[PDB]
Design a protein around this nucleic acid. Structure first.
Ligand SMILES: [Mg+2]
Ligand SMILES: [Mg+2]
Ligand SMILES: [Mg+2]
Ligand SMILES: [Mg+2]
Ligand SMILES: [Mg+2]
Ligand SMILES: [Mg+2]
Ligand SMILES: [Mg+2]
Ligand SMILES: [Mg+2]
Lengths: 61, 159, 205, 170, 293
RNA sequence: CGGGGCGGACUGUCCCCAGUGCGCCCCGGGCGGGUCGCGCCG
RNA sequence: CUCAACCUAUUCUCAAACUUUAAAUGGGUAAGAAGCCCGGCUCGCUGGCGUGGAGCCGGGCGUGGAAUGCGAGUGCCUAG
RNA sequence: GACCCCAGAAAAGGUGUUGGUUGAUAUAGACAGCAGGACGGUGGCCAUGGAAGUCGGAAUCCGCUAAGGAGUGUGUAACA
RNA sequence: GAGCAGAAGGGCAAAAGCUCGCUUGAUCUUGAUUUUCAGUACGAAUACAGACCGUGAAAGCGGGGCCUCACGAUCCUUCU
RNA sequence: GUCUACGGCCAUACCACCCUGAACGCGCCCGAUCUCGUCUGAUCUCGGAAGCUAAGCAGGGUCGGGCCUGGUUAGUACUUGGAUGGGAGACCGCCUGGGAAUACCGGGUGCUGUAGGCUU
């Protein structure tokens, strides 16, 4: 009739068999969840990087 | 059997320290948080808006977003056999700058200065931290005074 | 209709005081904790003797009452009704429960209050008697007799303190002389050398 | 000798008429206070329902007003005429304020009216020195300090000196 | 004794003091948080404000932005420097509040170089005016009124300082509900009685009102007005000359500090050795007086 | 463990009684670390 | 004269659902090249200000910035 | 009596023996034995039917003394 | 040591309590996130963004109740 | 050496009582025509400048309470890991590392940012 209710016994042994891996961090994390007003302005800044290229290469040279 | 309430078991966790109740000091609202800096999540209970969940109290994360009153923090959370990066919105009353990153950033600037000076002067200097080495050989003077004899004291029932 | 004390000898539970959560607790059997000449001044009874437990255990309020009466009767016989002062230094603040059997079995087995016990630690003082110097042998015998009312192992000790105070008997008198101590009923008041000078001027006058 | 900024003065007078119930009795009482002060009084309600007194919570029970300045000094003299300048010793509180009562309001200097009744009232003179208002100011409010306070003995001395009053040893 | 001592040892052990400037009754920290704290997505952008504090004898107008190490005042103008420019008497009134608000605006704009641009309303009229930024030019300086603990009802002098600053060229958000010309019943702004208040015509009306009724009360009230020979018929022109002088030269020249001998006026703190000696001497005097009997 | 000369403050010994710090300079005794230190010994 | 309650200074004994204080063991993060430092360019966001913030483009820096050990990363199908 | 878990024991006792702690007496004669004395006021007071040291309530002294409690027990109705 | 609707805990003093004045942010929208979690849903919650408003002199605050509870798929119906 | 305006940390800053306060200031203070609020010009708002440091405020004092920081308590309490350690148990000791809190006894009694004054 009655049986065991709950245990975390042997759970930690199972977790560490394949390791508890930290999430794979890498360059260029995603922009999900960032402020929409800030985000749509950065798109305008990226779009208009074309102009001022002549000034950039003049300064770099 | 345990309830699933969002603030179960936070009776002392979100309570204010002794004789530190009342108005929140204003410099906590004047801290500048940018994208990429490391912040400890505390979770004070005077402000009930933007409270982090109790599983993030004491955790440290990295800011990825800044709003008018809060920040978005990427903070690791361990769920059974996996760790996954949560993103939480926390008002600035419940965070503070982590000094571990400040200490390391200080040591980087000192290291780059030390390399710069050593190259321009003509020296090589150890920049890595080394673990505490075994003690060096030394002489201990008695100064003409014999060491004091120590003996265990007799037992007696104190009180 | 009380269980044998062997069923509640050990501190197995957490402390379970009578509070707003534990209600319906019967009164402890011991209600009197001081006997003899409780009104005697501090310098009348310079000798202090303790019964000290050596076991981390529980003593029932029934046993404390029995041992209190047993020590009182011997002290009265050998020292008179005003030749001593006894203080029981254990209070039965822990409620023990009983799961009363005639639903049947272990279902809903949490018990109802049954009585109260005092939790005693190793080296803790159970009982104290203060008296004159010439009654040292009578105090030891009185405390020895009261040992038989308790489950564990207890030691009789003659304290180096003066009476029921916390000051040593070999420096008590000259502290009173130099006004570091002032009697107040059965005890003393320690007056430190700090505070308003008006208190100091109340002394020395 | 004394600093001129320490002389005692009257802050307010605080007349009060506690009628038992609400209605035409209370309206007549407020009429009496208005005739006495030239100044519209305010009704006060009952904190709690007490049926041994016959009152209920939030029911208009009493009427009161506070008078300051020259008009207060005039009304106090009118009240002290009735008392014959005889205030008992215990009428003075430990904070330097005193008070008394009168049983009939007609002898205050108000002509009788058949419609209006026989209302009595309470006088409560609140004494003060210049500078007492710092406890009431909004910005940088403070206390007045120990020397600047008024004791029962100083209030009694002021009454004896100013109104040549008699303090009965009651 | 009959009653428990409320302020016993346990009371003081658990007592938490409020903030120091709350205990002195100088700062409303509920208002200060909403008013000095910048949005976090604006980072180190300063949030400027105009602190208007009216004193028993002075008007203080400052512009500050909050930092962690304390506030930073970038421009301050006082009403006690008004004798340099026209008006010499009758400070801490509505007309002087306008003058010091205008002086603060002109002083700050001169510090930033935005003088010719953002002149403001040179011709003083009481109606609503709000400076607009000019394209191709640096934007208008924006700050917010900080009234402190003042009760902001219609006619308060802090709104006189605000009116001077917005007419000086500063952009401060406001409504004309709190200017003296506003009428609560009709819910309309007169804008002409407000101009009179700016020009001190209500004070001039009082002077001639007292002149006709009781000359003794007139002397008692405006005693320092007979000195310096200020009359009601010349009040308005005096304030207009004050405005023009403020416009022409708002630069503050700090008075050079004089040589002073270093003097200790307040008693220094007694040392530990002195305190112990004082206790020993007091004890000795008690014993000596006792043996005298 | 202390000695000299000027400024405040304290004491129910007040006669110009007694005692305590502080700021500047002149001396004295003791302790420790650096010193091309300098010598002598191992 | 005496006993109550009251107040004051003490005194005995306690708390899973009390607490000023407060461990040990424990939990998170950091210990660089995706870093640091220079210049410049873009922005419709922000704005006293060539102001802030973010993004982008060039350049120079390697003593590879604790110990120890180990080769890692990633996908599909899947039984019990 | 005889070895983790583990398969049987407690309070309380012992002039069995062993070690330890504290104290006391003693050549000014300990201790134990054997042998003498163990007195007067006073058969002290209050208690009662009788309580004389010895059913009890209080007192608790003095002289002679080497010493002898106005009493440690047995005993008597009380004595003895 | 009161009060904040209620259970308890947290929090709160020119507050979050009390009294007034004006109001309807308890409204219209798209996503993101947190909580339970399988990292599914519901419920609840957090931070924004776009409208239209309220209030205040303004900074601001407000898309319900100071926070932790107060609730509900497919199919069908009904309204907009 | 101080003060004012605005503050940061939020008692080393608070609380009780006493003493002193030069100059500016800050106040108390005088009045209700206007602006504006009241039962009450007490508060608030406004217009002032005869008087006063009595109060607030500032500084100092008190074998002051509190608070802050040390010593002690104490290598004590508790505790990581270990043993075919002890003990009928309850519990205790040792090894290996970490290590408190009262009482009691000392010392201290706001630092400071920006702007602007006074101080022969
Ligand atoms: Mg199962
Ligand atoms: Mg049985
Ligand atoms: Mg149990
Ligand atoms: Mg406000
Ligand atoms: Mg919106
Ligand atoms: Mg809410
Ligand atoms: Mg103290
Ligand atoms: Mg250990």
């Amino acid at each position: 009739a009655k049986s065991k209710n709950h245990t975390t016994h042997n759970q930690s042994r199972k977790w560490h068999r394949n390791g508890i891996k930290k999430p794979r961090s890498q360059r260029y994390e995603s922009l999900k969840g960032v402020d929409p007003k800030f985000l749509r302005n950065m798109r305008f800044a990226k779009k208009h990087n074309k102009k001022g290229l002549k000034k950039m290469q003049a300064n770099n040279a | 059997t345990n309830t699933k309430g969002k603030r179960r078991g936070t009776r002392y966790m979100f309570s204010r320290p002794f004789r530190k109740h009342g108005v929140v000091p204003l410099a906590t609202y004047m801290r500048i948080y940018k994208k990429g800096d490391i912040v400890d999540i505390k979770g004070m209970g005077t402000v009930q808006k933007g409270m982090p969940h109790k599983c993030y109290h004491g955790k440290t994360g990295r800011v990825y977003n800044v709003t008018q009153h809060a920040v978005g923090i990427v903070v690791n959370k361990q769920v059974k056999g996996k760790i996954l990066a949560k993103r939480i919105n926390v008002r600035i009353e419940h965070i503070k700058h982590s000094k571990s990153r400040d200490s390391f950033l200080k040591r980087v600037k000192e290291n780059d200065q030390k390399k710069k000076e050593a190259k321009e002067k003509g020296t090589w200097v150890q920049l890595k931290r080394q673990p505490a080495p075994p003690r060096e050989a030394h002489f201990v003077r008695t100064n003409g005074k014999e060491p004091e004899l120590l003996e265990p004291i007799p037992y007696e029932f104190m009180a | 209709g009380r269980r044998p004390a062997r069923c509640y000898r050990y501190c197995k539970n957490k402390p379970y005081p009578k509070s707003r959560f534990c209600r319906g607790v019967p009164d402890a059997k011991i209600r009197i904790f001081d006997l003899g000449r409780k009104k005697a001044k501090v310098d009348e009874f310079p000798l202090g003797g303790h019964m000290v437990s050596d076991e981390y255990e529980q003593l029932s309020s029934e046993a404390l009452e029995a041992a209190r009466i047993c020590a009182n009767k011997y002290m009265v016989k050998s020292c008179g009704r005003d030749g001593f002062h006894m203080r029981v230094r254990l209070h039965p603040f822990h409620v023990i429960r009983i799961n009363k059997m005639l639903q049947t079995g272990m279902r809903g087995a949490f018990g109802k209050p049954q009585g109260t016990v005092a939790r005693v630690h190793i080296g803790q003082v159970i009982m104290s008697i203060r008296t004159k110097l010439q009654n040292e042998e009578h105090v030891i015998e009185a405390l020895r007799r009261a040992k038989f009312k308790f489950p564990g192992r207890q030691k009789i000790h003659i304290s180096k303190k003066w009476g029921f105070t916390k000051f040593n008997a070999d420096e008590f008198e000259d502290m009173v002389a130099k006004k570091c101590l002032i009697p107040d009923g059965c005890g003393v008041k320690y007056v430190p050398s700090h505070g308003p000078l008006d208190k100091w001027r109340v002394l020395h006058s | 000798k004394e600093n001129p900024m320490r002389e005692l003065r009257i802050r307010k007078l605080c007349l009060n008429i506690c009628v038992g119930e609400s209605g035409d009795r209370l309206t007549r009482a407020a009429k009496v206070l208005e005739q006495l002060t030239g100044q519209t009084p305010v009704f006060s309600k009952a904190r709690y329902t007490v049926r041994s007194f016959g009152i209920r919570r939030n029911e208009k029970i009493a009427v009161h007003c506070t008078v300051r300045g020259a008009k207060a000094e005039e009304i106090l003299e009118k009240g002290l005429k009735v008392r014959e300048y005889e205030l008992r010793k215990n009428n003075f509180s430990d904070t330097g304020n005193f008070g008394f009562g009168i049983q009939e309001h007609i002898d205050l200097g108000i002509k009788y009216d058949p419609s209006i009744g026989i209302y009595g009232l309470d006088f409560y003179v609140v004494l003060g020195r210049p500078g007492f208002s710092i406890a009431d100011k909004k910005r940088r409010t403070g206390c007045i300090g120990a020397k600047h306070r008024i004791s029962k003995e100083e209030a009694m001395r002021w009454f004896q000196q100013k109104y040549d009053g008699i303090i009965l040893p009651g | 004794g009959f009653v428990k001592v409320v302020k016993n040892k346990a009371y003081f052990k658990r007592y938490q003091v409020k903030f120091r400037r709350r205990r002195e009754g100088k700062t409303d920290y509920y208002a200060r948080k909403r008013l000095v704290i910048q949005d976090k997505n604006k980072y180190n952008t300063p949030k400027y404000r105009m602190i208007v504090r009216v004193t028993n004898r002075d008007i203080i107008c400052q512009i500050a932005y909050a930092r962690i190490e304390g506030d930073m005042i970038v421009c301050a103008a006082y009403a006690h420097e008004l004798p340099k420019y026209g008006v010499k008497v009758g400070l801490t009134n509505y007309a002087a509040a306008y003058c010091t608000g205008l002086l603060l605006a002109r002083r700050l704009l001169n510090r930033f170089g935005m003088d010719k641009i953002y002149e403001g309303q040179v011709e003083v009229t009481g109606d609503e005016y709000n400076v607009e930024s000019i394209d191709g030019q640096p934007g208008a300086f924006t700050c917010y009124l900080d009234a402190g603990l003042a009760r902001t009802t219609t006619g308060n002098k802090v709104f006189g300082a605000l009116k001077g600053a917005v007419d000086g060229g500063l952009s401060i958000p406001h409504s004309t509900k709190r200017f003296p010309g506003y009428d609560s019943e009709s819910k309309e702004f007169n804008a002409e009685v407000h101009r009179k208040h700016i020009m001190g015509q209500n004070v001039a009306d009082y002077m001639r009102y007292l002149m006709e009724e009781d000359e003794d009360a007139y002397k008692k009230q405006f005693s320092q007005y007979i000195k310096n020979s200020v009359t009601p018929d010349m009040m308005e022109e005096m304030y207009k000359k004050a405005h023009a002088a403020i416009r022409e030269n708002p630069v503050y020249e700090k008075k050079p500090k004089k040589e002073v001998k270093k003097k200790r006026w307040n008693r220094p703190k007694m040392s530990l050795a002195q305190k112990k000696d004082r206790v020993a001497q007091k004890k000795a005097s008690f014993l000596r007086a006792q043996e005298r009997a």
